[PDB]
């Protein structure tokens, strides 16, 4: 169920991958920019920080898939 059928994965990794539209893996505070610019919405670097920091567990300025996927997961944990 769980195990090789990655369907909850895909979604995550497809949002993911499509935000690093450079495919280097993370996306950066910048890139991240672009993605939420498209989104039709756009704050300021300040609450970019607050909230990629939010997440940040490392707070290295880029976002990885497991920061990624938490971020979505913990904005949607409700499910
Ligand atoms: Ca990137
Ligand atoms: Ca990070």
Do not use: H, W, Y
Not at 8 to 33: H, M, N, R, S
Not at 50 to 77: H, Q, R
């Amino acid at each position: 169920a769980d195990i090789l059928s990655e369907e909850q994965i895909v979604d995550f990794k497809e949002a993911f991958g499509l935000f690093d539209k450079d495919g280097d893996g993370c996306i950066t505070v910048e890139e991240l920019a672009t993605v939420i610019r498209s989104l039709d919405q756009n704050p300021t670097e300040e609450e970019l920080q607050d909230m990629i920091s939010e997440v940040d567990a490392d707070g290295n300025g880029t976002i990885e898939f497991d920061e990624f996927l938490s971020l979505m997961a913990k904005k949607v944990k409700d499910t």
